[PDB]
Symmetry: D2
Subunit: 768 residues, 4 copies
Amino acid sequence: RKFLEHLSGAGKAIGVLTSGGDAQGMNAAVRAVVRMGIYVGAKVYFIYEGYQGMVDGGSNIAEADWESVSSILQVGGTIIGSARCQAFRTREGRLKAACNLLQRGITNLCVIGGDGSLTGANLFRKEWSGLLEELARNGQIDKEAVQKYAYLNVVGMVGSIDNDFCGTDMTIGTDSALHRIIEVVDAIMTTAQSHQRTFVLEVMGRHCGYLALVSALACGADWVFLPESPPEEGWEEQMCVKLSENRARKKRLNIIIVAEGAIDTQNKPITSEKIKELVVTQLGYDTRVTILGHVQRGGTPSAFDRILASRMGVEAVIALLEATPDTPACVVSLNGNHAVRLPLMECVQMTQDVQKAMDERRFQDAVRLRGRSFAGNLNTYKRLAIKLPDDQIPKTNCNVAVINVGAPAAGMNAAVRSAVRVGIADGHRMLAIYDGFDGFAKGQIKEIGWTDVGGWTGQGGSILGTKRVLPGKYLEEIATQMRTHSINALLIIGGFEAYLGLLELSAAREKHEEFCVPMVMVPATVSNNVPGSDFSIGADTALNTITDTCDRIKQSASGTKRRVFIIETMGGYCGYLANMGGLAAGADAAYIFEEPFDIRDLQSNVEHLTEKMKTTIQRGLVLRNESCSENYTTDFIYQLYSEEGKGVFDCRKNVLGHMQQGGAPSPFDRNFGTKISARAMEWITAKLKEARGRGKKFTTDDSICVLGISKRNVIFQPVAELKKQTDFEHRIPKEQWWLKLRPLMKILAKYKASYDVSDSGQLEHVQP
Amino acid sequence: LRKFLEHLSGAGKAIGVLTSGGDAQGMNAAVRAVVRMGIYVGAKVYFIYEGYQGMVDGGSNIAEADWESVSSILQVGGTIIGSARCQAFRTREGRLKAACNLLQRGITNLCVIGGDGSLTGANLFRKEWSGLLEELARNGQIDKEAVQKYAYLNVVGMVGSIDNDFCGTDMTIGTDSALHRIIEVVDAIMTTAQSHQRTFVLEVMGRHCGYLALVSALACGADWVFLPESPPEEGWEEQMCVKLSENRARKKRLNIIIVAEGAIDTQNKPITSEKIKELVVTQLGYDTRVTILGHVQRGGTPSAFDRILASRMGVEAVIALLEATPDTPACVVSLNGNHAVRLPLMECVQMTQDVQKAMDERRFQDAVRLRGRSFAGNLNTYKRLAIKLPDDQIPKTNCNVAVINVGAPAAGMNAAVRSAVRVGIADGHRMLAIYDGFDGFAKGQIKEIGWTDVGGWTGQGGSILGTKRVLPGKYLEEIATQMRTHSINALLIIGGFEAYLGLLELSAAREKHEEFCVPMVMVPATVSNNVPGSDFSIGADTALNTITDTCDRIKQSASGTKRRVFIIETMGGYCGYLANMGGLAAGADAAYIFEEPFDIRDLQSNVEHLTEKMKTTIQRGLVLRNESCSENYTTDFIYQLYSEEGKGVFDCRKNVLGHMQQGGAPSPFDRNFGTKISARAMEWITAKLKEARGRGKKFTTDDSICVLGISKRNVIFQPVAELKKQTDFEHRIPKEQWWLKLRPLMKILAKYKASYDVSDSGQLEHVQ
Amino acid sequence: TMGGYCGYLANMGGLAAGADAAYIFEEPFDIRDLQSNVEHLTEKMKTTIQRGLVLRNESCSENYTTDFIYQLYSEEGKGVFDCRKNVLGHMQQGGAPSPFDRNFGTKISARAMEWITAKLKEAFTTDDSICVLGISKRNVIFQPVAELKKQTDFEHRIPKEQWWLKLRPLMKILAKYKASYDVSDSGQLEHVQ
Amino acid sequence: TMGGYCGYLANMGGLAAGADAAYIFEEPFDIRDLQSNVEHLTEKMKTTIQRGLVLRNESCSENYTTDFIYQLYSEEGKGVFDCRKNVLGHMQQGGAPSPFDRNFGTKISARAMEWITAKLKEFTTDDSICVLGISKRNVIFQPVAELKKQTDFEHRIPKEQWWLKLRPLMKILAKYKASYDVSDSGQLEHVQ
Ligand SMILES: Nc1ncnc2c1ncn2[C@@H]1O[C@H](COP(=O)(O)OP(=O)(O)OP(=O)(O)O)[C@@H](O)[C@H]1O
Ligand SMILES: Nc1ncnc2c1ncn2[C@@H]1O[C@H](COP(=O)(O)OP(=O)(O)OP(=O)(O)O)[C@@H](O)[C@H]1O
Ligand SMILES: [Co+2]
Ligand SMILES: [Mg+2]
Ligand SMILES: [Mg+2]
Ligand SMILES: [Mg+2]
Ligand SMILES: [Mg+2]
């Protein structure tokens, strides 16, 4: 162990500022920093207008209290304000700034911004000692103060919708921007026209095609323009050719995603207008083009971003405390869902190298410099967008069947599309099993083609159909179908039942030979209870459904009346939704199953919130997991809070229900589904090659697994070794990672909870 | 004396429908209506793809349409028929080639759905008709006798363009939808927080029409607007910058400038958005971003208003097309004050050209008047609320006018209060805000509200002032005391049915308590739309859109091979407005309402009827139910019935919208409705109070306690006293509900055989 | 009434209390049959009867619940009679046993023990070591659990052939309905033994 | 139990059946009192008692419903006892009247008629419209007009309910420590 309230920061003064362009989630970030600091006993200060406000000093720097960051979670942009400071580019600016900082006793800094803000911060750390000299020399600071305020603790959070700070995987604001983007695309896709249409959409990304890329495989674009993998000479005709080909496959709406910094093999800008003319001239299709403006910074921050920003705010504060005089200025980030600290300079460096690599037309290097992830997504997108002519795909004469098992989860279709195509592209013959195991036993199996899964990416529900019935009772019939259709591998995109399903099948692989094939499961349920994966397809979508409902509930006025909302969430026994949703929507409490409670705890939380309602808060929020308790039902809690609040606030109950489980999948899920399904198929492909084409009998333990997010990677884990770490009575994993975050959500609600911060991040170097 | 639809057969006639010009949300709803209405009256309808192009081209561009052709296109933007620009039709050769293909198919009845252009072109085609048949018989391309048979061309048009540039038409299909798209963007920018001042320049559409720009402006309380009809006065550059800094000083941290495409100055010189950008960047230096909302204004799903409007017009077009004689002028079906009307094409085409002439000739004041009484008023109202005169230039009246919210919260009450408060202040009154309705009124919760206090209220949901359903009955003594102490001279209640009841009670008390002998106006605000004396309510459109939105989602989600039917309970109490209109807008098979009693037999019949549709044509069925349509046949009852009867062919899903979606953000239509009536109501109070000073403080007459509502074709003030006659106080709904005449439409559109009293249909009238 | 899927209680109770109808699982019904019975009883209420009775098995249908039927009969009766709903519930499952049961329990338990005594006097892996002492043909015979599987529906936990169902058409014609009555199992002359 | 807002049935029934607690409207309670009684009874269940009883007036509270209380006692009893809920309902409001009532009804109706008979031997006055009932120690006719003073028309129950003086009895008999105003106790009188 190494807890938080055993890491006091009493006496220290933290300054937080947001620089560069604004990005959804910044407020969530400062809210976390401010409160986390104040909680550990530190004293935090706001620094308006990014670096500008620091140079200017004076009132541009104010102390922040617990209520400063109150109710800004669901707010885009930044209440602190963010701008570009030209003065800070100069030596005079840095000096004037260091002075105001010293004038306020602030030696601990938290910079929230993009590649720029961060590299600038890095440099400020270097010149620190040097700036204090020049200041003491010119008699603007004390001669002894040059020793006290001698150590500058700097820590950064990447908060930009660009995602251009190489060395970091995810950044605050991107998922949100992606939402904005996909919302537009979706709005155009629900429009029907008889003639062929081509939509050219220009997203952001100065010299980074990340946004453009993820946007592309989020809506199955026909073509993408990235600054890292520019189009090969003679693309103009190639593109037009691809559009007409897709047009012939019945795709009546082409979508071209263009990055701002789109360029050709010679760094020449590829304008959206050039693309417009290109198709209007060559193909003559109804072409419309919109340059998604700053509107990509608008809207409310997605659930992903609010949570990410909160986790980072904590990481920034604890990092800032444990920082010694000789500890490198770092940048808190996340790697495979694990907190990590990366030294500023190392990142600022690689960031500049990627630019260098691109200017020097060494594009293949730029692509590799962005990250293993970026390179993979790029390939996966190409793989799914560009199909090779049938004759160039050496057949494997293997029939790979894909199926949906479990309750429907947003993004199952994106998953099936991805698996079917990667399969076809690998030379297999794809088979679709409808209505899960139920239909499997009833022989409802048919072949699916490349165009049959077109446009499935953004579709909610399960086009294939999905059931909760498990294979146990019908092991026979299935083994039969599996024989008469000559199935060589199985890809189940489902939930917990898919796992219980795989386990039953790996048991019968004893009494039945038809089951000795490779089988992978891909986690898909809003619950996020599949053993072996930290995330599920459809989980993000559901979480966003929650924050969306809470946003609305707040923005509505009740006059002088104080109101408290009790909201029941899905998840069965898994309080993931309830807990993370609670954190993301800023709830006072989130009753879950994993943390038992009695009438006393209940009474306590009511009094606690009743107090907040009497003063500071105007709108209270309480979440409750479906099955957190059988006696203390949603109504029970509603009734309790209602009676106890009499006179200070009234209640409103609200059960989200399972109607919001089939809406369109969020960008994050359409990409999650696309990505794992592809890695899973890749696995099947390879397992089959072990057969040499004359068929093998797969008996091994690791040939029936769950592909999931584990340590910091997407690793395949044999179903057999997952039993150990799973509670089959409540169908939830024995060790739930997100529970370590529960004490965070609490202290943010002004509670005093023990926070085991042992899993916090630690120094590491950028992986090349 | 009354005409019915099944009596006026069209058997033997052939109707051709086409969509021309730019696409506009609601066009599908329109052709769906035309196709089916035609097919129903026994006519035979034909599709004409690509607007006029397809007519010129002929051949397969013209196909017969059957009942299923227009199936499930209601919630679809754009047009499945396709719409384009035909250059060939601009020429005499085109018109000839077209008239030939039309004759070649026996189509002499035409329905053109498009904008100013498409329509003027249609008009001209009617003129040259006889002339074209000559030239065709002369060149032996048509029969000599056919020149007599196909001698009469029945043309009827529907204005379907997001511009609304066709003179003589109040509202056109597609505008409300475009406005939604626009306001969605604005709203997305407003939820973004920044510390420094920001200025957003948004360029909406409207070739040479500033309608869109205008309504967009008072839909979000813009700081400034640029219209082609009322260009800015010379020297505006500095004037604008001055207004922005002033607003900046009143704490408005985000300026919004709405610019119409055709924005021009007093000399027809184009006023670019980029010029506006620089103007503020240079003079004020605020963070200025500008987006040219592209074609994205035609995207998204068509709003409820547009789907309904388009359906009502589709019928009007068909019945008009039938009752058309050889000597009956080619007209354009439209709506005037919610009443169907037919306007002769030429008259409209004319005025349309006159408005352009008026603008080119810098006779702007004429252009403004040519747009319509409405347009001129909105323009004024917007200016009035956007430009406040300096306190000293506003002669005080020394009158205290109190504004209050009474009844269940309705989306847009805040827009209403903002509008009333400001118009009041601008009229020199001292404004008083009564919180928490009558409850707070009696408890003396009255305070003064200022011009900036209601800033940005336009787009806020719920009731900032607070609202209760309590009636002044039991607290006459308390309330009267409060008016007396606060010196309340006029009262403006923005609320629902209970607000009408309050007014009835207050009236009766003005005898005993003198303090109630002041003017009292009521403005209809409830999602129910049950206020006696008004065809519409503030918050009704918002609610209706909530319904169609939920139905859209429910459909777009796949269930595999499974057929699904949804039962949805709507609000409204006893008023089936929501249920019925929502049903029509979402395309439901049935909508059980209170106003139309039903028994188990009717129930059983509709189930069988829909069960049939599910077995074939439909894949997704929809059934709506009013909250209180019956006490025994509850939502669950109907769910259970349809469920059992569908066993084997489809499964059910139940869903109660609930009152949680009664406090979301108000739809554009409502923020403007609220703004508009509240202003007219205040104007009334101002005028009443001035004759106090002259005529006499003798406010003990029915005519001084009114309900401002949409009646005949105007917004007229009706004394509460004479409304009692026409209202059923037991169920709190008006005795005569206009929308019920539309019920038989919704039915026949669902493939039922219902008697349709089409007596209220439109008839030839000349534009005012 | 209780019974799960077994409409014994509902049916026999209906007969015993003189009910117009007894909706049970074993005899599926649709909205038409339902509508018919309402009209039929509505008629009786208009004249002869002053008090009408309708019984419903717990699980006779999942869509046509107790409330459903209550609501239907209520609406159709409007003007001629009002309804009252009432769920016996499982609270009246633990009252004192009726004379018949205290004697039934005493009697079989004794015969069963007698069997055990005789079996354990023989000293088991055969199918007759495990039975179900119960009333069959005309005797209390021991039947091996194994051969009972054949004649039982494990999905609804009720025997495949329920003897009392032959009595259903009786309860009906007594309610003034016209039902086919298979009276094949009727009695026939025998000699007293 | 029935009674609307009048906890007569709940209270007296509680006393008569020996219940641990009888939640009524006339005596407001909060979650703390509630929690206390559960603990108190949970204790008795752990030892002495084998069967516990709790009564609740139909409308004693709108938030702490019958189910609420059932759920609370159920959760707090987990491990020591289980719960069973039961709503008497209005079906047992039409059974045969008990001997006491058939005689009560017979007796007052007769005295009431006797009054009418006497009144008709000679009406715009206010003592001509009474309410015959049991008051002090007699069955006296009281004009409806003077009864308004002592009645709460909002919950339709008299302002002063005599049986409430018995409430503290039912409690101490359940082993609670309640203040018992025994002022109305009896005093030595001579047989009259
Ligand atoms: N090389 C640098 N040296 C000093 N300061 C810098 C440097 N680069 C950036 N900054 C600081 O950051 C400010 C804004 O830079 P920039 O726009 O690159 O930040 P950003 O966060 O990467 O922007 P974005 O949010 O759009 O990604 C500069 O005006 C300056 O104050
Ligand atoms: N004067 C005209 N004579 C013949 N045809 C015309 C004329 N004006 C318009 N049209 C027909 O309408 C087509 C499109 O014109 P236009 O774009 O003005 O229509 P619209 O309905 O006003 O478009 P929108 O919906 O964008 O306002 C023309 O290409 C032509 O086929
Ligand atoms: Co290289
Ligand atoms: Mg930034
Ligand atoms: Mg940057
Ligand atoms: Mg058009
Ligand atoms: Mg036009």
